[PDB]
Amino acid sequence: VLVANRGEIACRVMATCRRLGIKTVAVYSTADEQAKHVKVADESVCIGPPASVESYLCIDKIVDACKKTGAQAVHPGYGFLSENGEFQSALQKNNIVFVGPDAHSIESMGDKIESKRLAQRAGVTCIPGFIGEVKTHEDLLRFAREIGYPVMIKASGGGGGKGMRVAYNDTQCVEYYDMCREEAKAAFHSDKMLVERFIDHPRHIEIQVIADRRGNTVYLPERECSIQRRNQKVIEEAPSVLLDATTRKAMGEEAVAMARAVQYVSAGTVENVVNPQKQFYFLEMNTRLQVEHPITEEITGVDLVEQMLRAAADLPLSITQDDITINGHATECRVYAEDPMKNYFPSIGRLTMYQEPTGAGVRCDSGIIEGSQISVYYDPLICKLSTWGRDRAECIGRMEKALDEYVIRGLRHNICLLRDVVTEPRYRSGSITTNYLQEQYPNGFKKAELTAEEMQLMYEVAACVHLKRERLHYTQGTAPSERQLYLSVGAGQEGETPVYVRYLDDSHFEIGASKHGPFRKMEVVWKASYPIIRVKDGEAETVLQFWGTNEVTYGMQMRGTTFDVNVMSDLQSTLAHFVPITEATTNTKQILSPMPGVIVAIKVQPGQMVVAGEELLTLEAMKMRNKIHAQADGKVKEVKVKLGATVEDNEVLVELE
């Protein structure tokens, strides 16, 4: 079989075949000649230029290419043009298997409209509210009391969240209807309002579904997709805390009942919104192969890929709802190349200087091997880290530990945000909401700080590392074994903390306050000039990272955050006070081209916003295109140098004001 995706899922598929003993083929674009899925595959064929359209999206190339492998079936994947009719039609022109759902169900359910029809076909507890215009305030109050809901005032013709106000009491209902009619009459030319059961605070619970072309339909355990930034989810978890069998059993039964309704074959997944009063709302249903199943597979072992490919041959499944159980729970997170602390700045075109994944009792699905890069015209996802567990505390701690052991170098990421979110006591309380993120991050993003004991431990580990790397340079036995260091982070030596060290063995020290002070005998295990640093005092265990140094300042990472600790002796400490600290030039002015050349491409527009790290234009000289970018600034005021202006000579190409 041949896949249709070029991400982690492709690798997953070419991995499921291992046990299924199925030879696999994987196509690629020109830029992806070095992707892992190309080498993992048994066969590879090029699909032209790497721009999205020609790459994979070029059905004609793809379907035509499906004539040499011999494979009797070809996976549709989950992204790009997966589950598409124009594609399903073409594949049934050449009479080949789709390894996916049937057309009628797909167009009946994935369609934007008429989904409410199928929803109300059997009702299935669809959105509740007075179905019609509320012409009077009396009707609005009466229908609000009917269910005593937060009103969910929404315009009949309005969409996207415009014309919506949340009413909690009758006076609020009247005032918000008065505002809503005024807003909607001006904005959408419709005064027709509707009132529905608004949700106190949503959790966005999701229910998984599987089926088959013969029978033995099964309901998979539900999942969580509460956390969501810009309508994109981050953290997922299958057995949500607010789970009662009274609801859940009916959820599975109703999902299976809806399944046969449209004769769905390859079930996508069911979407719900759940309030603390344990309701459910079947709508916004999915018909795509969601790849958040690893979590479910961790709590079940139900290999969705194997079962769906088995059903693609008109055979029933190998599992029934009778044996499906729960053996704990799993947590999954997504690693993006999106720089959060810097206003969510995108960082692309950077191959991995060097990276190593966490592999301690955890699972990681990724398509980015060492020496791989991310283009602008693709998904900036790095890895899909998922860890098995049985308890919240157990599963989370694992994630905590596994986050710190993920070495990524060569480009930014959002691991700090994931770490801070997981460590927050609100997240460990047990329950969350969908507005959780912006509720806990009002102004931008700011990572939480360190407690006193954590900073002390970081100091101790830094001193141990300094001594260990110092002993390497000495010759033969003429080496020291004890010092007294003065650690102080910050440019002003904030909190000078005297530290000792003794190095009793290769990976054991006798850290103390100073000489003639009680000693603790911690342990540090670190390979010289490497990232990972495992330190264990008593039971507590920590993992820190070592970035680099200039022999007075150490670049060490603590809880997924970079710091610069200063490790200096008595003389250096007493002398660093008497050192000039000059301030570098802070110039917000025009930028000039360093060398002569020709401008062939421009990226930014005249007199608009500019952010740090953004490419601006590209000169070509002596057969070579450079690319001077914007180091750091907010905006510009200038006149653009036109295309093909072979002038340069250190002119003012862009002027920053």
Binding site: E370, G371, L472, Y474, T475, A528, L571, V579, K623, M624
Partner: protein, 489 residues
């Protein structure tokens, strides 16, 4: 007790003794001479004698290995040299010539001492002669912590490496007063000879540091690389890194387009051991990189082009930089590893008006004269005389390697097509340039001739380099008998 140094520190500056204490080991400095006077007897100098006479000379010890050093003192007479100051320095250099030990000096002198007359010139001449004679015998490093003017500037110049401190140091031959007197332009001391000027414009300073503390901390690290003398072998340090570490990221560094640029450090860093690069002259002639690095625990010399800056084109400044680095590396038996990516020489009238012919020959002379083991890797391209200059196999090179997408040709395809068909029918571009580039802009022809040993996968570079550098440990080559060469100055 912190007497007499409060006046110094109040100006945000350190003292000579404090610098010496910071450089060496905690308790291994033994000051040599401390009670010496100037015995001048002129211009009312018979009084105000000083015990130290403005110099601190000792022995010290760094990383368990011996050293010699001296430091000027700015408080006493402004650091001026004399018939008596220079005697201590001469004695130290002579002793460090008998024993195979290097010398490091921290310059702070304000100029010559006028009250001694021509005795200051005598001392300067003796120091110059010692530097000239002992260059190439023991490594010499110089750091400039404060003002350095007059004719005293020449002795740091002859030394192998000169470093500078950022805020409070400068160096030049003639002061701005004379410049105003003759030309009439008002230029400040920093605008004339500041650390930035010598870092970027003149190319004299080999580096710049932000503070004295950082200067000492990194000077120790630099010292950890050098061999002790001319006859001593290259130092080898223990290291947990191993030649079997996987480097497969090199397969993707070179883009598939011939007009796109990349950073050569992405090729340099994987091959060498982790966090073991010490760049030399980082802000001058950025199209070429030179420095020191370790390969399997032994120090080597790195010289590579960079297509990031000016398409990696050789030039005057790059030629001088590479020539000096190669000469120093060969003088002390240090292996050389080079990475080649050059389209040719920089074209321009200013270049010929500035003597490209002289300067470009220096790098070729340095590469041909060298007798240390050499390893060369051609990543993408090498054209014209630039291929010859950058350690080609014909210049007694030990082992040469190429990557599968390399190109070695006489010149670009356009010029060859033009010269090979004078008045051939128009549109000849499309069906001739492509064919010529396909047939002869590839390493197959150069491999057929025997100019590259083998064509290797980019993932095997570390393995090959470690193997070759281990095997070549005991090469013995000698040049014909000469009093000395005649390099194109």
């Amino acid at each position: 007790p912190t007497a007499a140094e409060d006046l110094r520190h109040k100006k945000k500056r350190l003292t000579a003794m404090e610098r010496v204490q910071l450089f060496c080991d905690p308790g291994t400095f033994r000051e040599r001479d401390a009670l010496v006077e100037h015995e001048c007897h002129n211009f009312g100098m018979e009084k105000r004698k000083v015990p130290g006479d403005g110099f601190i000379t000792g022995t010290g010890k760094v990383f368990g290995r011996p050293v010699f050093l001296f430091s000027h003192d700015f408080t006493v007479f402004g650091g001026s040299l004399s018939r008596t100051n220079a005697a201590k320095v001469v004695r130290i250099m002579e002793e460090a010539a008998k024993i195979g030990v290097p010398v490091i000096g921290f310059n702070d002198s304000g100029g010559a001492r006028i009250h001694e007359g021509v005795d200051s010139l005598a001392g300067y001449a003796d120091i110059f002669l010692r530097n000239t004679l002992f260059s190439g015998v023991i490594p010499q490093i110089s750091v400039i912590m404060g003002p350095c003017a007059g004719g005293a500037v020449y002795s740091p110049a002859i030394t192998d490496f000169t470093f500078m401190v950022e805020t409070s140091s400068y160096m030049f031959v003639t002061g701005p007063e004379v410049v105003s007197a003759v030309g009439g332009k008002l230029v400040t001391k920093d605008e004339l000879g500041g650390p930035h000027v010598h870092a970027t414009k003149s190319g004299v300073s080999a580096g710049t540091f932000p503070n004295d503390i950082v200067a000492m901390a990194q000077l120790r690290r630099l010292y950890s690389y050098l061999p002790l003398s001319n006859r001593d072998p290259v130092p080898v340090l223990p290291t947990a890194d191993e030649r079997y570490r996987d480097v497969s990221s090199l397969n993707t560094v070179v883009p598939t387009e011939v007009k796109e640029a990349y950073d050569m450090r992405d090729v340099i860093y994987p091959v060498i051991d982790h966090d073991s690069f010490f760049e030399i002259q980082p802000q001058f002639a950025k199209n070429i990189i030179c420095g020191f690095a370790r390969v399997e625990g032994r120090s080597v010399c790195i010289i590579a082009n960079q297509p990031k800056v000016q398409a990696g084109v050789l030039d005057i400044d790059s030629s001088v930089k590479g020539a000096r680095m190669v000469r120093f590396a060969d003088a002390f038996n240090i292996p050389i590893i080079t990475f080649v990516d050059v389209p040719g020489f920089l074209p321009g009238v200013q270049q010929e008006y500035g003597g490209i012919i002289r300067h470009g020959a220096k790098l070729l002379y340095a590469y041909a004269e060298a007798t240390v083991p050499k390893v060369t890797i051609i990543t993408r391209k090498a054209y014209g005389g630039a291929y010859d200059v950058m350690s080609s196999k014909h210049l007694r090179g030990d082992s040469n390697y190429a990557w599968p997408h390399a190109e070695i040709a006489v010149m670009g395809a356009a010029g060859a097509c033009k010269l090979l068909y004078s008045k051939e029918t128009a549109e000849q571009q499309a069906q001739r340039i492509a064919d010529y580039e396909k047939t002869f802009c590839t390493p197959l022809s150069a491999a057929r001739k025997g100019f590259v040993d083998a064509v290797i996968d980019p993932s095997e570079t570390r393995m090959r380099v470690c193997e070759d550098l281990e095997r070549l440990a005991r090469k013995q080559l000698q040049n014909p008998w000469k009093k000395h060469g005649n390099i194109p100055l």
